[PDB]
Amino acid sequence: ASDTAVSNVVNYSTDVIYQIVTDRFVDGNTSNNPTGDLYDPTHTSLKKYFGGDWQGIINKINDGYLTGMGVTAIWISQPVENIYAVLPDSTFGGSTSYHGYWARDFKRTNPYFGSFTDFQNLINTAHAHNIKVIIDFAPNHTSPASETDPTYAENGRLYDNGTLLGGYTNDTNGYFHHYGGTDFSSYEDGIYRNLFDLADLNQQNSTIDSYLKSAIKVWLDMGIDGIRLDAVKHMPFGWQKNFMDSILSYRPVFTFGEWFLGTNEIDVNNTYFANESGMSLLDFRFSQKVRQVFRDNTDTMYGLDSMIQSTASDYNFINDMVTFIDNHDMDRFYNGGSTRPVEQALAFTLTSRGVPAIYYGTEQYMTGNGDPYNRAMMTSFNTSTTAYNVIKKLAPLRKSNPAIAYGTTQQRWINNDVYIYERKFGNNVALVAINRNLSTSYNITGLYTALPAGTYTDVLGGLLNGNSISVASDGSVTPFTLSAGEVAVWQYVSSSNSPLIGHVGPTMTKAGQTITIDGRGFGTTSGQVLFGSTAGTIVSWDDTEVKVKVPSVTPGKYNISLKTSSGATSNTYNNINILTGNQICVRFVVNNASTVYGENVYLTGNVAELGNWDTSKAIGPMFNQVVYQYPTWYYDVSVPAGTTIQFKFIKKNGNTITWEGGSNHTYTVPSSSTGTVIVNWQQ
Ligand SMILES: OC[C@H]1O[C@H](O[C@H]2[C@H](O)[C@@H](O)[C@@H](O[C@H]3[C@H](O)[C@@H](O)[C@@H](O)O[C@@H]3CO)O[C@@H]2CO)[C@H](O)[C@@H](O)[C@@H]1O
Numbered sequence: 184a185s186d187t188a189v190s191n192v193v194n195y196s197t198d199v200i201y202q203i204v205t206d207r208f209v210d211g212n213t214s215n216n217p218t219g220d221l222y223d224p225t226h227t228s229l230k231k232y233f234g235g236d237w238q239g240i241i242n243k244i245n246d247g248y249l250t251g252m253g254v255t256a257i258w259i260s261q262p263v264e265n266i267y268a269v270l271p272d273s274t275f276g277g278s279t280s281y282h283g284y285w286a287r288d289f290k291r292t293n294p295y296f297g298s299f300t301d302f303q304n305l306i307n308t309a310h311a312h313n314i315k316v317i318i319d320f321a322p323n324h325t326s327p328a329s330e331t332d333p334t335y336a337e338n339g340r341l342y343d344n345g346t347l348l349g350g351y352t353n354d355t356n357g358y359f360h361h362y363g364g365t366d367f368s369s370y371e372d373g374i375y376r377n378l379f380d381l382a383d384l385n386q387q388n389s390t391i392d393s394y395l396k397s398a399i400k401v402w403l404d405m406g407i408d409g410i411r412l413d414a415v416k417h418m419p420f421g422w423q424k425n426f427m428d429s430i431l432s433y434r435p436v437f438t439f440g441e442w443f444l445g446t447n448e449i450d451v452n453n454t455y456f457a458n459e460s461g462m463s464l465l466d467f468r469f470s471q472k473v474r475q476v477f478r479d480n481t482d483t484m485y486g487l488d489s490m491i492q493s494t495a496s497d498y499n500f501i502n503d504m505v506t507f508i509d510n511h512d513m514d515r516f517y518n519g520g521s522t523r524p525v526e527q528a529l530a531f532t533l534t535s536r537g538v539p540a541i542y543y544g545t546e547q548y549m550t551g552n553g554d555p556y557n558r559a560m561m562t563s564f565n566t567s568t569t570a571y572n573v574i575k576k577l578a579p580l581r582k583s584n585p586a587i588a589y590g591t592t593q594q595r596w597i598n599n600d601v602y603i604y605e606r607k608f609g610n611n612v613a614l615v616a617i618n619r620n621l622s623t624s625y626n627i628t629g630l631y632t633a634l635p636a637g638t639y640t641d642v643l644g645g646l647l648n649g650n651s652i653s654v655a656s657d658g659s660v661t662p663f664t665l666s667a668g669e670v671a672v673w674q675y676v677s678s679s680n681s682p683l684i685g686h687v688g689p690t691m692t693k694a695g696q697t698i699t700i701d702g703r704g705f706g707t708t709s710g711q712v713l714f715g716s717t718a719g720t721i722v723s724w725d726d727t728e729v730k731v732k733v734p735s736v737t738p739g740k741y742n743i744s745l746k747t748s749s750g751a752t753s754n755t756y757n758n759i760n761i762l763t764g765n766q767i768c769v770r771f772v773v774n775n776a777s778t779v780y781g782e783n784v785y786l787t788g789n790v791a792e793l794g795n796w797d798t799s800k801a802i803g804p805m806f807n808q809v810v811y812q813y814p815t816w817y818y819d820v821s822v823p824a825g826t827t828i829q830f831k832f833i834k835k836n837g838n839t840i841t842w843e844g845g846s847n848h849t850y851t852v853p854s855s856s857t858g859t860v861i862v863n864w865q866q
Pocket residue numbers: 594595596597598628629630631
């Protein structure tokens with residue numbers, strides 16, 4: 184099998200995701216439509232059900248709309264059962280669960296979308312057409328509730344395959360967080376507090392932890408090829424890391440979370456998450472910058488490049504970052520005026536690092552500022568749009584040009600309006616020229632490239648006013664004019680490659696598991712995969728793909744390297760996280776840990792999951808507000824189940840490290856349910 188295989192659910196670098204808002208796409212079956220207040224046949228009441236269903240998607244697949252576009256994957260709304268109540272709205276006079284973000288039963292389907300049967304047809308049909316199916320998943324909450332008024336909505340009631348677990352009011356079981364609502368003041372504030380009025384789930388609760396894990400297996404069993412975790416910014420890192428392990432242990436599938444970042448916003452917690460959570464993230468830094476440059480004009484091409492560079496240093500796995508120019512939460516990219524800007528944003532995105540995602544209707548020039556104006560019904564299905572063709576032409580490149588899929592990014596020419604970058608993966612190359620100026624042409628001189636000597640034509644076929652170029656023996660390019668709004672794409676696909684690792688998934692494993700190595704020039708005869716210096720067991724060997732079983736090495740981060748049967752050594756793919764064992768979520772609590780100003784408390788310990796006594800990699804700074812109040816600190820950490828750990832807390836400020844006194848604390852991590860440890864600061 185090849186990395187481009189639809190069966191390659193662990194890699195998305197060569198794919199193109201098409202984000203669909205189920206209800207607003209296509210009503211393939213009217214018989215399943217809602218009745219009364221819920222439904223709106225007219226499609227004018229933006230907060231009501233329109234009738235979009237899985238059958239409608241199936242139709243768009245079978246009819247060639249999506250396929251003809253070059254889309255290799257689809258990301259649909261949460262398939263789980265939603266509340267049935269019609270919330271009050273002043274503007275739209277009615278607010279429903281049309282979006283599927285108000286869960287009611289994570290073990291059942293949304294009757295309006297279809298049945299498990301209709302879901303299967305979707306999965307199957309999609310697969311038969313070589314399209315991967317991604318689903319939205321929001322384990323952070325249920326629905327909008329009011330502790331005071333159990334008469335509001337459905338009180339955020341949670342069901343387990345029909346049987347009620349509990350509501351928001353009278354939550355004797357402690358399934359929810361009754362800490363009020365978040366104001367985004369702090370990281371901890373937005374975790375243990377309500378996201379708006381949504382009933383916050385207490386994943387620390389054994390029942391909830393188990394429920395959520397089993398709930399996901401239901402869908403994994405349905406044949407899904409990916410998951411989009413909702414509000415990963417509103418749940419504890421520890422629990423999420425532990426949740427990921429359960430998924431990857433059951434059946435690995437590409438997973439990416441939603442960590443909202445504003446304009447010019449950079450969050451260290453966000454970076455750490457993407458680097459340790461065991462899941463990928465939506466590239467908000469990318470998305471927000473692209474809009475600044477191509478849409479709102481609040482930054483230059485210089486800002487775009489710096490984003491490309493800073494991004495590449497922060498993220499350990501940039502090839503996994505899910506890019507995009509807009510979404511159901513943002514104002515539609517197209518905001519009137521010229522359509523050139525969108526196309527340039529699409530082309531840039533399609534040829535840039537990571538995994539591109541396209542919001543439904545982008546190719547239709549759909550407009551709409553703010554929710555729910557940005558969630559209008561599918562306008563038209565015209566395949567003539569310049570935007571529709573852009574995707575059609577560029578999408579496939581991700582499969583044909585490994586440089587576009589896993590290659591690096593390097594600037595070759597840049598001014599305030601012009602950006603000429605180059606994607607390189609060995610000998611394979613891709614050169615893209617963009618001129619944001621819709622009225623100014625530029626004379627390009629002094630340009631150099633890795634493109635072999637010769638004459639290159641535009642892959643876009645002049646679609647965006649692009650043309651051909653000539654590269655000299657010294658990689659120099661003949662001076663040319665970059666007309667206004669021009670977009671050109673030149674490439675060179677090598678005929679022969681050396682061992683080159685482009686991708687590795689998953690990035691979070693355990694000894695005995697199987698990882699998939701994607702790249703080029705591995706050979707047809709089995710070679711050797713090494714986790715540092717320790718060789719693994721080959722499960723399958725191909726020129727572009729290698730499946731290997733993780734060796735029983737010391738749990739920790741490892742660097743992957745390949746070795747063809749001919750002795751040729753590949754490049755290394757670093758920071759593969761090898762855990763100690765099955766993860767479990769344990770809450771650490773330490774009392775009487777008073778500190779000075781600017782001093783925080785951290786957790787260090789016996790295992791890799793605990794940093795292995797490395798104070799620089801200590802867990803924290805620990806929390807001290809919501810659940811527990813200072814001087815008592817706490818934190819949700821993922822640890823190896825059934826393991827006896829030795830730990831100790833420390834205080835860190837910036838230039839000082841105060842360890843806890845006495846002997847190390849000892850604890851045996853549970854095997855099933857979640858756990859909690861409470862200790863007192865040793866002097
Ligand atoms: O040869 C010395 C010089 O070479 C390298 O410079 C290259 C730039 O890195 C590259 O950006 C490009 O420069 C263009 C600028 O992007 C643009 O602002 C405008 O000024 O046109 C320039 C083209 O001349 O090309 C040059 C090479 O031609 C290298 O990076 C430098 O450190 C070094 O000084």
